[PDB]
Design an enzyme around this catalytic site. Structure first.
Site, PDB file in Angstrom:
ATOM      1  CG  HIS A  12      20.658   3.080   3.198  1.00  0.00           C
ATOM      2  ND1 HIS A  12      21.209   3.745   4.276  1.00  0.00           N
ATOM      3  CD2 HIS A  12      21.694   2.578   2.486  1.00  0.00           C
ATOM      4  CE1 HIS A  12      22.522   3.723   4.162  1.00  0.00           C
ATOM      5  NE2 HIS A  12      22.836   2.962   3.130  1.00  0.00           N
ATOM      6  CG  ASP A  34      19.061   4.830   6.725  1.00  0.00           C
ATOM      7  OD1 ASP A  34      18.634   3.698   6.484  1.00  0.00           O
ATOM      8  OD2 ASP A  34      20.202   5.197   6.265  1.00  0.00           O
ATOM      9  N   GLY A  89      29.901   1.067   2.662  1.00  0.00           N
ATOM     10  CA  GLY A  89      30.260  -0.214   3.185  1.00  0.00           C
ATOM     11  C   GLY A  89      30.156  -0.287   4.717  1.00  0.00           C
ATOM     12  CB  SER A  96      25.264   2.165   5.532  1.00  0.00           C
ATOM     13  OG  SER A  96      25.690   3.389   4.854  1.00  0.00           O
ATOM     14  N   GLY A  97      24.826   1.143   8.440  1.00  0.00           N
ATOM     15  CA  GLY A  97      24.209   0.225   9.356  1.00  0.00           C
ATOM     16  C   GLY A  97      24.995  -0.096  10.634  1.00  0.00           C
TER      17      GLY A  97
HETATM   18  O1  LIG Z   1      20.190   1.580  -3.582  1.00  0.00           O
HETATM   19  C1  LIG Z   1      19.583   1.690  -2.510  1.00  0.00           C
HETATM   20  N1  LIG Z   1      19.916   0.935  -1.414  1.00  0.00           N
HETATM   21  C2  LIG Z   1      20.834  -0.187  -1.465  1.00  0.00           C
HETATM   22  C3  LIG Z   1      22.119  -0.006  -0.732  1.00  0.00           C
HETATM   23  C4  LIG Z   1      22.491  -1.103   0.075  1.00  0.00           C
HETATM   24  C5  LIG Z   1      23.727  -0.960   0.753  1.00  0.00           C
HETATM   25  C6  LIG Z   1      24.513   0.163   0.718  1.00  0.00           C
HETATM   26  C7  LIG Z   1      24.073   1.219  -0.107  1.00  0.00           C
HETATM   27  N2  LIG Z   1      24.796   2.366  -0.207  1.00  0.00           N
HETATM   28  N3  LIG Z   1      25.112   2.980  -1.512  1.00  0.00           N
HETATM   29  C8  LIG Z   1      25.880   4.012  -1.281  1.00  0.00           C
HETATM   30  C9  LIG Z   1      26.146   4.130   0.135  1.00  0.00           C
HETATM   31  C10 LIG Z   1      26.912   5.154   0.787  1.00  0.00           C
HETATM   32  O2  LIG Z   1      27.476   6.095   0.106  1.00  0.00           O
HETATM   33  N4  LIG Z   1      26.961   5.171   2.146  1.00  0.00           N
HETATM   34  C11 LIG Z   1      27.567   6.095   2.953  1.00  0.00           C
HETATM   35  C12 LIG Z   1      28.110   5.689   4.194  1.00  0.00           C
HETATM   36  C13 LIG Z   1      28.707   6.547   5.080  1.00  0.00           C
HETATM   37  C14 LIG Z   1      28.745   7.918   4.727  1.00  0.00           C
HETATM   38  C15 LIG Z   1      28.224   8.309   3.517  1.00  0.00           C
HETATM   39  C16 LIG Z   1      27.624   7.452   2.614  1.00  0.00           C
HETATM   40  C17 LIG Z   1      28.379   9.778   3.388  1.00  0.00           C
HETATM   41  O3  LIG Z   1      27.985  10.421   2.395  1.00  0.00           O
HETATM   42  N5  LIG Z   1      29.021  10.244   4.451  1.00  0.00           N
HETATM   43  C18 LIG Z   1      29.320   9.119   5.420  1.00  0.00           C
HETATM   44  C19 LIG Z   1      25.416   3.104   0.716  1.00  0.00           C
HETATM   45  O4  LIG Z   1      25.337   2.823   2.005  1.00  0.00           O
HETATM   46  C20 LIG Z   1      22.886   1.138  -0.808  1.00  0.00           C
HETATM   47  N6  LIG Z   1      18.606   2.566  -2.294  1.00  0.00           N
HETATM   48  C21 LIG Z   1      18.071   3.473  -3.240  1.00  0.00           C
HETATM   49  C22 LIG Z   1      18.891   4.292  -3.994  1.00  0.00           C
HETATM   50  C23 LIG Z   1      18.300   5.171  -4.897  1.00  0.00           C
HETATM   51  C24 LIG Z   1      16.925   5.171  -5.021  1.00  0.00           C
HETATM   52  C25 LIG Z   1      16.082   4.346  -4.267  1.00  0.00           C
HETATM   53  C26 LIG Z   1      16.673   3.445  -3.368  1.00  0.00           C
END
Ligand SMILES: O=C(NCc1cccc(-n2ncc(C(=O)Nc3ccc4c(c3)C(=O)N=C4)c2O)c1)Nc1ccccc1
Ligand SMILES: [Ca+2]
Ligand SMILES: [Cl-]
Lengths: 57, 247
Positions: free
Chosen positions: B41, B90, B183, B185-186
């Site tokens: 993602h 993912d 921040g 993720s990955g």
């Molecule tokens: O926008 C898109 N991708 C680009 C992107 C790049 C980098 C980071 C992100 N990105 N944004 C939000 C978060 C995030 O909340 N990460 C989390 C981490 C750890 C935990 C949690 C959440 C959790 O809930 N419990 C533990 C994240 O990682 C998105 N895709 C897309 C979105 C919507 C539709 C289609 C595609």
């Protein structure tokens, strides 16, 4: 054998036909004559933390 | 990372920081001198693949200390089954343009064999998760690398104690005190067994980090070991993004 306590292997374990088991080590390690233990063969083997390994050396 | 502590410099030497046009994108895990594992993602919105950089040996983002090593990303490989904007599958495998140099501050995490990971590492209760992500929900990201010890749940217990597929696992705490976060993720979920550390999970995402009643969700790396190993034996292809069949 490998499903229970990792077959006694430090790292990787394969079952063979019979009561036979072979342990193996990741790249950068070798298997000792005990047939279970793995020892590094390179300076920076995977999954070891150099500053902690040298604090214990 | 919410509710952890600073990873002392050099104690998380496999951690990768991913940057796009110099800005923090995601974390990653070094598994060999040219290969990094991250979350699919992280790449859903990249426009220009040329501006993706991986940094090894990072610790304090405020300073340069000479242990950092930056590389261009030559290939981003994503499973065919991953759908942008979702959790399942993912995972991403990143080929660096040039190897990193292993040092006291840059060391790969071992990618385990599937059997070992399923039979043994899946039952080690606690593992470490790390990154420069938000220190709180709706908070600032960290300047020093953070690390958190989290316990893994069996999936039946996750569903009870709270979609979770066989490609994921839950780990962490349901009280809102301790979690991975945006921040991170990955980044790695690293598991210790008899003196060596292994990659068992990738920080993925859900609705909101550190939410009462919810655990962190991690990609179950054991499902992808064969997939990853086959790709690491393959030659690179033109064009940075590659979608590779899964299984
Ligand atoms: O926008 C898109 N991708 C680009 C992107 C790049 C980098 C980071 C992100 N990105 N944004 C939000 C978060 C995030 O909340 N990460 C989390 C981490 C750890 C935990 C949690 C959440 C959790 O809930 N419990 C533990 C994240 O990682 C998105 N895709 C897309 C979105 C919507 C539709 C289609 C595609
Ligand atoms: Ca630095
Ligand atoms: Cl391209």
């Amino acid at each position: 054998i490998c499903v229970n306590e990792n077959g006694g292997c430090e790292q990787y374990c394969s079952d063979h036909t019979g009561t036979k088991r072979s342990c193996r080590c990741h790249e950068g390690y070798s298997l000792l004559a005990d047939g279970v233990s793995c020892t590094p063969t390179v300076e920076y083997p995977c999954g070891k933390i150099p500053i902690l390994e040298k604090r214990n050396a | 990372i919410v509710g952890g502590k600073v990873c002392p410099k050099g104690e998380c030497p496999w951690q990768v920081l991913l940057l796009v046009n110099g800005a923090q994108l995601c974390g990653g895990t070094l598994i060999n001198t040219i290969w990094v594992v991250s979350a699919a993602h992280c790449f859903d919105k990249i426009k220009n693949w040329r501006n993706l950089i991986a940094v090894l040996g990072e610790h304090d983002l405020s300073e340069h200390d000479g242990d950092e090593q930056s590389r261009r990303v030559a290939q981003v490989i994503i499973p065919s089954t991953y759908v942008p904007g979702t959790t399942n599958h993912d995972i991403a495998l990143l080929r660096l343009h040039q190897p990193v140099v292993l040092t006291d501050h840059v060391v790969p995490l071992c990618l385990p064999e599937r059997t070992f990971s399923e039979r043994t590492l899946a039952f080690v209760r606690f593992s470490l998760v790390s990154g420069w992500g938000q220190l709180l929900d709706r908070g600032a990201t960290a300047l020093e690398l953070m690390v958190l010890n989290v316990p893994r749940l069996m999936t039946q217990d996750c569903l009870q104690q709270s979609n979770i597929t066989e490609y994921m696992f839950c780990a962490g705490y349901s009280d809102g005190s301790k979690d991975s976060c945006k921040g991170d993720s990955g980044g790695p979920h690293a598991t210790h067994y008899r003196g060596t550390w292994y990659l068992t999970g990738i920080v993925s995402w859900g609705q909101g980090c550190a939410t009462v009643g919810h655990f962190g969700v991690y990609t179950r790396v054991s499902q992808y070991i064969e997939w990853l190993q086959k790709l690491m034996r393959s030659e690179p292809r033109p064009g940075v993004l590659l979608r590779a069949p899964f299984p």
